[PDB]
Structures are given as C-alpha cells and as structure tokens.
Amino acid sequence: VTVLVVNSGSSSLKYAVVRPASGEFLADGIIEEIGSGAVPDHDAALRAAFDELAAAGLHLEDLDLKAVGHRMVHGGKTFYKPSVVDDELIAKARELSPLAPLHNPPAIKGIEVARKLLPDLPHIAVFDTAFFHDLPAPASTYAIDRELAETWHIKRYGFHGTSHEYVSQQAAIFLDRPLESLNQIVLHLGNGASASAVAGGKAVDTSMGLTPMEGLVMGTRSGDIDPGVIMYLWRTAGMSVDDIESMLNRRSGVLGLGGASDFRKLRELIESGDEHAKLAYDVYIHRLRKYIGAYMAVLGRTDVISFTAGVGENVPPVRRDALAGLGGLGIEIDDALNSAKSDEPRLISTPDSRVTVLVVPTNEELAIARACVGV
C-alpha cells in the first residue's frame, strides 16, 4: 500500500509518499513561503509538491496510491477517528476553524486542492485530538458552570495527538519495555508546543485545551495566561475579543516576548547579548519546568521523559535547562549524551538517573500514513 501525506499549514505544505507497512518513504519535501510570487496560495503549493515529485522521477500515476492522508487539527465532538473526507466533514472543520484558526483553515485548503487534483482517491483526515479522546474526566473537565460547559461541548480536546502517540510508542520500543508498563511524559516542542502524560500507553493529561492556545509557551502563542489579562485588555486597553485572540496566537510566545521568528534565531539573539530574547527563553523554560513537574505528579511514578519536534529534537540547551536541578525528582541529564550530534532516538540521562530521559524524533508523515490504512 502507498499513501500520499499532506500537512498543509499556513505558511508551508509538507508532503510525503509513504508505504506504511514497511515505513519506507519514496519521497518527502516541504513547499515553503506560501504567498510568495512562485507559490501564492495552497493550491499552487500542492501543485508545486507534484512538480518536485515529478522532478525526482516519481510519478504518482505509476504508484499504487490507495489514499491521501491530511492533518486536521480540530474535528470537535463529531470527528476524531481517521475519517473519510466528504462535504460533511469539510463543513464541520470549517465551522470549527475559529477553535484552531492557525491550522484548520490551511488544512481545509490543502484538502480542497488535493480533491481537485486527485478526485478518485479516498482522502482521509487524521485528527490531532484522537489520542486524547479518552482523557480521564478529571483531566478534561474545566472548573466552570457544568450546564454551560455541556451545553457548548466545552472540554479539553488536546492536540499534537499523533506525535504524542507515536513518540510514546517509540520510546517503549527504544527501551524494549512494554508500552503498558510505562508512565511517560512527552514534550512536543515545535512551533506549537505541548506536553502529555501517558500512563501505560493511554493519555491521562495534556497541555493544550479546547483549543491549541493553552499550556506551554510557543513560537507565537502565549500558552497559559491569567483569564483576568484577557478581561483587562478588553475593558481597559480597549482591544476587541478578536484582537486579543489574535495577539495571543500571533504576537505572543517567543516572538512576542523575545522578538524571535523561530527558535534558532532566539538562541542567536541570546548569544548576541539581547536581554529581551534571554527573558523570553527563561520564561519558556520556566513554563516547561512547571509542566514536567506537574505531569510527574499526575503520573505518580515517572519512568520516561521524551523530547520531540523541532526544538525538542535539535536544541540541547532546552533539554538541559528544562531538567536542571531535579536530582531530587530522580532526573539527571548526561551532558555529553545530551550534546551529541545525532538525529536518532537516543538516551540523554545518566546511568543513575531514576527517570530515563530520551530524544525521540516525531514522524507525522509515517503516523498519518499508517492511520489511513483500512479506513
């Protein structure tokens, strides 16, 4: 079986052609700077991905393509399992776009162009929420008016579920220990950033909320913030609710506080003596330390902590700084291991660390491909 995988984000479109059984990748790539002269919209972007495949000597028509898998961030209550795309599903994803305004809209546009180019294949949506569907009620229920919550279906959905799931599975395998025997924390530190607590393979907590706005500090998102700040910006700073949301999603996190377009730039700013960048980094780490401790308490016993996604996989100082000074919680980083140049699943804790600490790279494309099978 062969699958085309599309992850259509606001600014870029990631694609791969994958054989899920073997895991082999026949091609992968990223079309960047959507809105450029060359790639002005998502429709241009998928067409360009097709040109790159062709340029590589890959012709989809000769491949056994059985499905096209898409990342969708929010499906609300109705859609969370891998689902065959139809007009119904697209209508619901559109309805829910305001719950995930940075992700659902370009995902839908990715679907729209893909269904035009490949109208006779099944298109399958794979949802970020799926892994968290069975979160325990005490972890997913906000402490608000119960009638109100249930009336509007307010609960913690959680996101990055395919990464948290994949990484928790792969950490067990790396340790050659049964998934069901392990209590784990997974730290998905990318443009979006989320933590999960996984107890014997089952998600028991995660940091994002009804929407991807809750939790860790992110690239442009605030994460956790006092609800009073929102009320004050509305009441006293005179900002509209939409403008406050926009600020929290797009002019917050490392960018808003630190001035950095992405995490590589931030670390460069810090290296150049920029105090604002250093504060934004320290705020990011302080938040991350708090989620790690919080989730150790949720689990009771913690066997494994794994770092993943762009920052988690590639920035040793984040991993060091997140875990520094936690000998009394059973955690000790091996600095030589942590600093190793490597892209492989790997150990970063010392032999005497009671908690095992890993880097376990995410593979969204493989996860989506496998989730298409059988649907």
Kindly identify the residues of this chain, within the stretch 128-157, that bind its own copies according to CB under 8 A: 137-139, 141-146, 148-149, 151-152, 154, 156
Q: Tell me, what amino acid is at 77? A: K
For the record, the structure tokens of 213 come out as 């706005």
User: CB of 308: closest distance to its own copies in angstroms?
Assistant: 19
Residue among 321, 352, 299 nearest 139 (CA) = 299
Choices 23-31, 42-50, 121-129, 216-224; region in contact with its own copies by CB under 8 A = 216-224
In terms of phi and psi (left: phi > 0; alpha: psi -120 to 50; beta: otherwise), the region of 158 is left
128 catalytic residue (yes or no): yes
Choices 104-112, 146-154, 245-253, 259-267; region in contact with ligand AMP by CB under 6 A = 259-267
Contacts of 64 (CB under 8 A, 6+ apart): 1, 2
Between the CA of residue 61 and those of 24, 121, 205, 371, what are the distances in Å? 18, 11, 43, 22
Rule CB under 8 A: is residue 354 a binding residue for its own copies? yes
Query: Does the annotation flag 344 for ligand binding?
Result: no
Query: Does the annotation flag 110 for ligand binding?
Result: no
Residue among 41, 42, 60 nearest 51 (CA) = 60
For the record, the structure tokens of 147 come out as 């009638």
Interatomic CA distance for residues 298 and 37, integer angstroms: 49
User: CB of 192: closest distance to its own copies in angstroms?
Assistant: 13
Of 312-331, binders to ligand AMP (CB under 6 A) are 314-315
Question: Is the Cβ of residue 112 or residue 262 nearer to ligand AMP in the bound state?
Answer: 262
Choices 11-19, 79-87, 109-117, 274-282; region in contact with its own copies by CB under 8 A = 274-282
Rule CB under 8 A: is residue 293 a binding residue for its own copies? yes
User: CB of 360: closest distance to ligand AMP in angstroms?
Assistant: 13
Contact yes or no for 335/287 (Cβ under 8 A): no
Q: Which residue has the tokens 């949720």?
A: 298
Query: Does the annotation flag 191 for ligand binding?
Result: yes
User: CB of 242: closest distance to its own copies in angstroms?
Assistant: 8
Rule CB under 8 A: is residue 294 a binding residue for its own copies? yes
Give the residue ranges of DSSP H helices in 73-142: 87-95, 104-117, 137-140
Of 280-309, binders to ligand AMP (CB under 6 A) are 309
**Which residue ranges make up the site for ligand AMP (CB under 6 A)?**
190-191, 219, 262-264, 309-311, 314-315
